[PDB]
Amino acid sequence: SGEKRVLSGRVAVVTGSTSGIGLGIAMRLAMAGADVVLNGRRQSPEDSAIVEKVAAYGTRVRYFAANMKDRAQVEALIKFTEKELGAVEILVNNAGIQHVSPVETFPSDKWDEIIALNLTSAFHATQLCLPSMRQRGWGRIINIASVQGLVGSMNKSAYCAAKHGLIGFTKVVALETATTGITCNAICPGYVYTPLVEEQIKAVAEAKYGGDMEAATQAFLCEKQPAKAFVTVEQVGDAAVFLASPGADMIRGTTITVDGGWVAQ
Amino acid sequence: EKRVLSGRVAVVTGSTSGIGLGIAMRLAMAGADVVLNGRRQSPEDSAIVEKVAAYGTRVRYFAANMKDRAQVEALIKFTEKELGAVEILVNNAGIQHVSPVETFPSDKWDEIIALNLTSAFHATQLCLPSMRQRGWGRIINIASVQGLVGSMNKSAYCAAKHGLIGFTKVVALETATTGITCNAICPGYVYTPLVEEQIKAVAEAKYGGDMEAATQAFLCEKQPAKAFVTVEQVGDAAVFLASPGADMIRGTTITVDGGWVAQ
Amino acid sequence: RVLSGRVAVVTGSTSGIGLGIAMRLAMAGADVVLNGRRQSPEDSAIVEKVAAYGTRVRYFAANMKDRAQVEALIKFTEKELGAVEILVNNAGIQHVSPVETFPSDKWDEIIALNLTSAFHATQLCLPSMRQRGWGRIINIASVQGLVGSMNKSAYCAAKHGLIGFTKVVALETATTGITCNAICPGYVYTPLVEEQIKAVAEAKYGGDMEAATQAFLCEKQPAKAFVTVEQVGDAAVFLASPGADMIRGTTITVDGGWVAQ
Amino acid sequence: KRVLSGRVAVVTGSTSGIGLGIAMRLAMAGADVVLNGRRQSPEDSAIVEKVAAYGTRVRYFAANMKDRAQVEALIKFTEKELGAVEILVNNAGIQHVSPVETFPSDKWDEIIALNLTSAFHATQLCLPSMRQRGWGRIINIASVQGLVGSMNKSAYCAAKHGLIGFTKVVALETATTGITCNAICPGYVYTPLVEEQIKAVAEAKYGGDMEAATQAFLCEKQPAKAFVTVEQVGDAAVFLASPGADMIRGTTITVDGGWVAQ
Ligand SMILES: NC(=O)C1=CN([C@@H]2O[C@H](COP(=O)(O)OP(=O)(O)OC[C@H]3O[C@@H](n4cnc5c(N)ncnc54)[C@H](O)[C@@H]3O)[C@@H](O)[C@H]2O)C=CC1
Ligand SMILES: NC(=O)C1=CN([C@@H]2O[C@H](COP(=O)(O)OP(=O)(O)OC[C@H]3O[C@@H](n4cnc5c(N)ncnc54)[C@H](O)[C@@H]3O)[C@@H](O)[C@H]2O)C=CC1
Ligand SMILES: NC(=O)C1=CN([C@@H]2O[C@H](COP(=O)(O)OP(=O)(O)OC[C@H]3O[C@@H](n4cnc5c(N)ncnc54)[C@H](O)[C@@H]3O)[C@@H](O)[C@H]2O)C=CC1
Ligand SMILES: NC(=O)C1=CN([C@@H]2O[C@H](COP(=O)(O)OP(=O)(O)OC[C@H]3O[C@@H](n4cnc5c(N)ncnc54)[C@H](O)[C@@H]3O)[C@@H](O)[C@H]2O)C=CC1
């Protein structure tokens, strides 16, 4: 084996880490030395390959399918990690969904589902992990919020509500743990090119650009993101590694915004 | 009697006591017709209606549980039948539960989210189409300082109030080119039963039942003015938001908090 | 009339937002001292417009960048009308430039007028307000005090700083009858904005002021309409009223949705 | 072999406190560093040695950052000695505690000049080279006092708020380039700037008891009930200077033990 790395020995759980930002975070944590438990909504043929991709960085990697909207499955994910790898030390609440719709016709079940996954599941997971972190005197809770947790955007009422709520939750957890070795913080990405964003760009391309994905992508990006470029899953992962590292011991209850200038204007 | 909100039809949820009643009173004092609302009927409802009717406008009362979307709709339909379209919607009904995160009851978390955030979405969704048809509306969401900052042992409440503020922004952006605005009022501590219960808990835990000491300590921790905000002041902010001078106030917070968030 | 008998000073109230604020304060019953950088032939008519509401109106020319002239303005008010009870720090200027070529003198001027002059005036008025037990300090900030915009580095810095100042003054007075708050307008159609629109009209739109005005407004303001000087005045009256006794150290943003997105 | 290897950094006010901690962490991450203080001191060579312990090139230049000509001389000295300035850390700053009513006019002006305007001058001087090279980092050391207010610190809160507004504009003007501009907002760090305040409070209110004064000073504002360290602020600077921050633009990294969260 090689030299120890900044997070060597730490056990991380990243919810919704079979795709997009969650996978980028899992990869960056593993590259920084952490053991990692990956998670997706359902078992899929691709899980083995993803596990091996993350495990190529030499740490212990596991996978556990669990619907984060079901508190029993959240508990089963945490208990699986405890049995397979050990106490959960880094919890990354990342699993999330989007639904674009004006408020007047926003479906009730979609509103409830976005609240349940993008906000309440983070509460359940944090609640289940905090007692062990307090007993051990160390912890990291990293909540994947959004720029949409700091500002609003049209046709994203439920998502903006949930993400704003997740930031408020973050502050409270940080304050309740402020004199301990546990920190809680949120990362607020701007647009990152994942399926969650690709589906929106496809809707725009069909609606306004005759299917031209290129024009629709440039228009989608430039409406909101002054950099006129996407944030990458690797950059969000680097922010998670930063928050998890010793230099962030006194970063508490705050947002790390990685958004190409979106919230600055 | 030409008053700034004369004839406007207002619905204030959870307005049988506390801040909601203060808001109803100030809206009526400004000339609005007002529909009061409580979770269930009480013998004192006629007295509360009379209090609000002292300002010379049309007052109605409708019992409805804002956590039940069918009852939110019933409240809106009742208002339409009695007074006409809902022109001012004040989403105020709300609850609190103090607990550390580790032991926060799952049911209480869900209830605080349902009433303090999701009920506002349901009422706004039900009222917006009419406001768009009529070319005018006000949606006024009663958030809190706890929607802008965190406080220990209030995880569900801070989450819901932050979310209500995010919701406010989106509604305002979707209506920005119309005569409809949506904004939030963020009070600091107001001396209502929701706060008095907390002060009582602090008094028993830490001050041997002394309510004066407990009250001053409760206020001083958070509120630089060392005094309570009043229900009348919250009502005055609602009147300001509903007035013509606020036609271009959109998606923002009016914080009435004695300096809480300034530090 | 909620402000009847109160004595107000509005800096930079010979045009635009400041004049709208003075009008609204007078309508609410306040006596008002108007102020501009230097005397102008329209001063008499501006006093007359404000005086139409039956209160006492005065005018005093003073460069707010000169502390001695700020003190002269306060002293003139105290002689003519009485103790300053409502202070509106409004006088302000703009200069649009990329950071690299931003003139040093223009940076200094924007800081001096848009931030430091408010400190000087507040410092001069607070002792009387504390003695009386009541006061209102209303700082005219901007959305540019809460977010950034390209080519406005000095102005954004000064307006952010004015908001920070507002918070400190409010905390130092929080247990008194004195409040300090900031109003943060979005775009309002005043000469300060018209000069910017003219520059972009000449550069990009062939001099078409109407087309340029729309493009300028819609870049930043979701309402796709200007905020008015009357609306900013109404916010000032609200902050000066008894309903705002516990509004302290905060921002009243009147911006058509600019900061909400 | 390190993340900032080969980058040339200038840290204003790096002979003490947070600036020295930032210089040390940047050097540890592989950057060459130019140190700076208000004037020459007997300790300068020892400070150079501290930073040079990490195997990079280190230089020192005394310059009053309130004097635009001396800011330019610092930049040109760096260009001559080490090369183009690639990382600019605007850190030099001062404090003065006073109620608004009696706040001295000259102290207000001095705090604005150093804590806000000097950052503007240094940024203006450095941006053309960064644009020519297609890469840059401007890191402004703000404060929690740039996001909320505190009693008796009107000038400082105004300057720090202004520095954050400035940060946003610079970031927006460079958003489509490889130059980023951001601010770090520390809470209380036990430097001379804070030690002086605590000593004043101890004498005025706690009978000279520095333990009691420190506890009260921290407890009033900082929920962690502990100081942030200069090393942690330095780690935040390294993070902002690293490739993972290529798309962090116009924002604040708050390192404050929970101060702004409540
Ligand atoms: N893509 C973007 O631009 C931004 C995304 N985000 C946030 O980042 C997080 C990840 O999003 P993306 O990577 O973009 O999305 P994605 O769609 O690529 O991935 C979502 C992941 O969550 C999992 N997931 C979904 N529902 C689940 C459930 N009920 N239980 C367990 N897992 C579930 C999926 O299996 C997948 O692994 C989300 O919280 C999203 O809100 C935040 C800001 C910007
Ligand atoms: N009291 C305070 O210090 C502050 C309160 N607030 C907010 O103000 C609002 C009002 O609170 P308070 O007046 O303090 O509380 P309160 O307990 O005095 O009044 C709550 C009102 O809501 C009604 N209510 C409760 N559950 C309901 C339901 N399911 N459906 C309909 N009505 C229901 C009650 O009947 C009562 O009329 C809440 O949203 C609260 O979060 C915000 C900031 C500070
Ligand atoms: N117009 C807009 O869109 C916005 C304006 N503001 C602010 O509102 C305030 C007023 O601006 P506008 O009405 O737009 O501009 P304006 O140019 O119409 O009015 C400026 C006023 O300030 C006075 N003034 C200028 N320099 C002065 C000095 N050195 N001493 C004394 N008085 C002086 C002028 O004579 C004039 O009365 C400014 O602080 C500005 O930053 C804020 C947000 C938006
Ligand atoms: N100590 C604290 O708690 C916090 C400090 N800060 C900020 O951190 C920065 C560094 O402050 P500290 O390390 O705490 O103070 P310090 O007093 O320990 O260090 C000040 C440094 O700035 C230099 N300096 C002062 N005036 C100068 C001038 N005119 N030209 C050039 N250099 C000058 C000094 O020589 C010294 O190197 C300041 O901007 C301060 O506002 C921000 C948040 C918290």
Query: How far is Cα A142 from Cα A170, in angstroms, rounded to an integer?
Result: 8
| Closest approach atom of ligand 1 to CA A159 | 41
Ligand nearest to the CA of C145: 3
DSSP C204: H
- By Cβ distance, the residue of C99, C168, C170 closest to D173 is C99
Give the pair of three-digit tokens for residue A232. 């990458």
Task: From chain D, pick out residues whose CB is under 8 angstroms from the CB of A218.
Answer: none
- In the chain, the amino acid numbered A21 is I
Q: How far is CA B88 from the centre of its chain?
A: 12
Give the pair of three-digit tokens for residue A163. 């993400």
Ligand nearest to the CA of D260: 4
Q: Is D194 exposed, middle or buried (0-12, 13-18, 19+ CB in 10 A)?
A: middle
Assign A100 to helix, strand or coil: coil
- Taking the centre of ligand 3 as the mean of its atom positions, its distance from the CA of residue C12, in whole angstroms, is 6
Q: Do A120 and B104 touch (CB under 8 A)?
A: no
What's the CATH fold of domain C7-186+227-252? Rossmann fold (3.40.50)
State the helix-helix crossing angle for B69-82 and B119-134, rounded to 10 degrees: 30
DSSP string, A179-221: TTTEEEEEEEE--B-SHHHHHHHHHHHHHHSTT-HHHHHHHHH
Find the catalytic residue in A63, A159, A193, A209: A159
Other C-beta atoms lying within 10 Å of the C-beta of residue A132: 16
Give the pair of three-digit tokens for residue D199. 């000593």
**Which chains are adjacent to chain D, needing at least 3 Cβ pairs under 8 Å?**
A, B, C
Assign C191 to helix, strand or coil: helix
Give the pair of three-digit tokens for residue C213. 């005005």
Q: Is C41 exposed, middle or buried (0-12, 13-18, 19+ CB in 10 A)?
A: exposed
- Taking the centre of ligand 2 as the mean of its atom positions, its distance from the CA of residue B94, in whole angstroms, is 4
Q: How far is CA A57 from the centre of its chain?
A: 21
Experimental method: X-ray
Q: Which of C151, C130, C146, C150 is nearest to C85 (CA)?
A: C130
Q: Which of A88, A247, A252 is nearest to A174 (CA)?
A: A252
Give the pair of three-digit tokens for residue C179. 């409040």
Find the catalytic residue in B55, B61, B157, B189: B157
Q: Which of C11, C144, C23, C2 is nearest to C84 (CA)?
A: C11
Determine the length of chain A: 265
Question: D61 phi and psi, to 5 degrees?
Answer: -150, 115
A262: CB partners within 8 A, 6+ apart: A147, A151, A190, A191, A224, A225, A226
Q: B161 and B151 in contact (C-beta within 8 Å)?
A: no
D102: CB partners within 8 A, 6+ apart: none
B62, β-bridge pairs: B37
Gap from A226 CA to chain D (nearest CA, Å): 6
Q: C259 and C143 in contact (C-beta within 8 Å)?
A: yes
Assign D238 to helix, strand or coil: helix
Residue in C with minimal Cα distance to B235 = C243
Q: B100 and B143 in contact (C-beta within 8 Å)?
A: no
Give the domain ranges of chain C.
Answer: 7-186+227-252, 188-226
Active-site positions of D read 156
Other C-beta atoms lying within 10 Å of the C-beta of residue B140: 27
Query: How far is Cα D201 from Cα D213, in angstroms, rounded to an integer?
Result: 6
Quick check: CB of C161 below 6 Å from ligand 3? Answer: no
B11, β-bridge pairs: B35, B89
Give the pair of three-digit tokens for residue B223. 């509120």
Q: B142 and B234 in contact (C-beta within 8 Å)?
A: yes
Assign C73 to helix, strand or coil: helix
Query: How far is Cα C253 from Cα B254, in angstroms, rounded to an integer?
Result: 8
- CA Rg, chain A, in Å? 18
Q: Is D80 exposed, middle or buried (0-12, 13-18, 19+ CB in 10 A)?
A: exposed
- In the chain, the amino acid numbered A162 is A
Q: A191 and A156 in contact (C-beta within 8 Å)?
A: no
Query: How far is Cα B53 from Cα B51, in angstroms, rounded to an integer?
Result: 6
Q: Do B125 and A104 touch (CB under 8 A)?
A: yes
Q: A171 and D262 in contact (C-beta within 8 Å)?
A: yes
| Closest approach atom of ligand 1 to CA A197 | 1
Question: C182 phi and psi, to 5 degrees?
Answer: -125, 140
Task: Give the DSSP H/E element, type plus range, for residue C74.
Answer: helix C67-80
Gap from B200 CA to chain C (nearest CA, Å): 24
Q: A29 and A241 in contact (C-beta within 8 Å)?
A: yes
Give how far Cα B242 sits from Cα of A215, B122, B132, Å.
42, 20, 16
Query: How far is Cα A221 from Cα D152, in angstroms, rounded to an integer?
Result: 44
- Taking the centre of ligand 3 as the mean of its atom positions, its distance from the CA of residue C17, in whole angstroms, is 7
Gap from C62 CA to chain B (nearest CA, Å): 30
- By Cβ distance, the residue of C175, C254, C257 closest to B226 is C175
Give how far Cα D238 sits from Cα of A7, B207, D80, Å.
17, 48, 24
Give the pair of three-digit tokens for residue A150. 């700091």
- Taking the centre of ligand 2 as the mean of its atom positions, its distance from the CA of residue B93, in whole angstroms, is 5
Query: How far is Cα B28 from Cα B121, in angstroms, rounded to an integer?
Result: 25
Find the catalytic residue in C155, C187, C189, C205: C155
Give the pair of three-digit tokens for residue C167. 């918070």
Residue in A with minimal Cα distance to D186 = A251
Q: Which residues of C210-230 are buried (b: 16+ CB within 10 A; e: fewer)?
A: eebbeebbeebbbbebbbbbb
Q: C83 and C71 in contact (C-beta within 8 Å)?
A: no
Query: How far is Cα B169 from Cα C62, in angstroms, rounded to an integer?
Result: 41
Torsion of CA C169, C170, C174, C178, to 10 degrees: 80
Residue in B with minimal Cα distance to A101 = B174
DSSP A65: E
Q: Which of B147, B152, B144 is nearest to B162 (CA)?
A: B147
Query: How far is Cα D238 from Cα A240, in angstroms, rounded to an integer?
Result: 15
DSSP string, C77-126: HHHHT-S--EEEE-------B-GGG--HHHHHHHHIIIIIHHHHHHHHHH
Q: Is B220 exposed, middle or buried (0-12, 13-18, 19+ CB in 10 A)?
A: exposed
- In the chain, the amino acid numbered C3 is L
Q: B181 and B247 in contact (C-beta within 8 Å)?
A: yes
Q: What is the longest distance spanned by two Cα atoms in chain C?
A: 58
Q: C138 and C100 in contact (C-beta within 8 Å)?
A: no
Q: How far is CA C232 from the centre of its chain?
A: 9
Query: How far is Cα D150 from Cα D221, in angstroms, rounded to an integer?
Result: 9
Give the pair of three-digit tokens for residue A149. 């947790």
C7, β-bridge pairs: C31
DSSP D136: E
- Taking the centre of ligand 4 as the mean of its atom positions, its distance from the CA of residue A259, in whole angstroms, is 29
Query: How far is Cα B43 from Cα B144, in angstroms, rounded to an integer?
Result: 30
Assign A70 to helix, strand or coil: coil
Q: Which of A159, A163, A196, A199 to mutate to test the pocket of ligand 1 (most atoms within 8 A of CB)?
A: A196
Gap from A52 CA to chain D (nearest CA, Å): 24
What's the CATH fold of domain B9-188+229-256? Rossmann fold (3.40.50)
Give chain C's contact residues with B (Cβ, < 8 Å). 167, 170-171, 174-175, 186, 222-225, 227-228, 230-231, 233-235, 237-238, 241-250, 252-257, 259-261
Gap from C63 CA to chain B (nearest CA, Å): 31
Query: How far is Cα B159 from Cα B101, in angstroms, rounded to an integer?
Result: 12
Gap from C167 CA to chain D (nearest CA, Å): 5
Top CATH class of A11-192+231-258 equals: alpha beta
Q: C2 and C241 in contact (C-beta within 8 Å)?
A: yes
Task: From chain B, pick out residues whose CB is under 8 angstroms from the CB of D150.
Answer: 263
State the helix-helix crossing angle for D68-81 and D118-133, rounded to 10 degrees: 30
Q: Which residues of B107-137 are buried (b: 16+ CB within 10 A; e: fewer)?
A: ebbbbbbbbbbbbbbbbbbbbbeebeeeebb
Q: Do B248 and C234 touch (CB under 8 A)?
A: no
Tell me which CATH homologous superfamily contains domain D8-189+228-255: NAD(P)-binding Rossmann-like Domain (3.40.50.720)
- By Cβ distance, the residue of D99, D164, D172 closest to C149 is D172
Query: How far is Cα B144 from Cα A254, in angstroms, rounded to an integer?
Result: 19
Residue in A with minimal Cα distance to B144 = A168
- By Cβ distance, the residue of A123, A131, A173 closest to B109 is A123
Q: Which of C88, C80, C99 is nearest to C135 (CA)?
A: C88
User: What is the pairing mode between strands C178-185 and C7-10?
Assistant: unpaired
Q: C4 and C14 in contact (C-beta within 8 Å)?
A: no
Ligand nearest to the CA of A95: 1
Q: Do B121 and A175 touch (CB under 8 A)?
A: no
Question: D3 phi and psi, to 5 degrees?
Answer: -65, -35
Residue in A with minimal Cα distance to D178 = A227
Instruction: Write out residues with Cβ below 6 Å of ligand 4.
Output: D 12-19, 37-38, 64-66, 91-94, 114-115, 141, 143, 186, 188-189, 191-194
Q: Which of A4, A5, A6, A24 is nearest to A14 (CA)?
A: A24
* B189 belongs to the catalytic site: no
Query: How far is Cα C69 from Cα C91, in angstroms, rounded to an integer?
Result: 14
Q: Which of B11, B48, B30 is nearest to B237 (CA)?
A: B30
Choose, out of B72, B101, B144, the residue to mutate when testing the contact with A (most A CBs < 10 Å).
Answer: B101
Q: C231 and C17 in contact (C-beta within 8 Å)?
A: no
User: What is the pairing mode between strands B88-91 and B253-256?
Assistant: unpaired
3-state secondary structure labels for all residues of chain B: CCCCCCCCEEEECCCCCHHHHHHHHHHHHCCCEEEEEECCCCCCHHHHHHHHHCCCCCEEEEECCCCCHHHHHHHHHHHHHHCCCCCEEEECCCCCCCECHHHCCHHHHHHHHHHHHHHHHHHHHHHHHHHHHHCCEEEEEECCHHHCCCCCCEHHHHHHHHHHHHHHHHHHHHCCCCCEEEEEEEECCECCHHHHHHHHHHHHHHCCCCHHHHHHHHHHHHCCCCCCECHHHHHHHHHHHHCHHHCCCCCCEEEECCCCCCC
Query: How far is Cα A212 from Cα A216, in angstroms, rounded to an integer?
Result: 6
User: What is the pairing mode between strands A35-40 and B88-91?
Assistant: unpaired
Determine the length of chain B: 263
Residue with tokens 């939110």: B72
Residue ranges of alpha helices (H) inside D93-209 are 105-112, 118-133, 154-173, 192-205
A27: CB partners within 8 A, 6+ apart: A53, A54, A57, A233, A234, A237
A231: CB partners within 8 A, 6+ apart: A189, A190, A191, A192, A258, A259, A260, D247
B149: CB partners within 8 A, 6+ apart: A171, B158, B260, B261, D260, D261, D262
Q: Which of A123, A93, A149, A134 is nearest to B156 (CA)?
A: A123
Smallest CA separation from ligand 4 atom 39, residue: D93
Q: A248 and A183 in contact (C-beta within 8 Å)?
A: yes
Give the pair of three-digit tokens for residue D212. 């009691």
Question: A165 phi and psi, to 5 degrees?
Answer: -60, -40
Assign B10 to helix, strand or coil: strand
Q: Which of A135, A26, A12, A29 is nearest to A77 (CA)?
A: A12
Residue in C with minimal Cα distance to A225 = C261
Assign D88 to helix, strand or coil: strand
Q: Which of D11, D12, D18 to mutate to test the pocket of ligand 4 (most atoms within 8 A of CB)?
A: D18
